[PDB]
Design brief:
This protein has strands at residues 7-8, 21-22, 27-28. It is mainly β. Its main location: secreted.
Length: 34
């Protein structure tokens, strides 16, 4: 269970396997890909 880009998050572990909860607005956003 996770969220996607701009997903209201409080931590990086709160997003999916690609997003990154950035502290700049507590939002999950992925960066590039693997």
């Amino acid at each position: 269970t996770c969220r996607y880009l701009f997903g209201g998050c409080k931590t990086t572990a709160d997003c999916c396997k690609h997003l990154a909860c950035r502290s700049d607005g507590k939002y999950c956003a992925w960066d590039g890909t693997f």
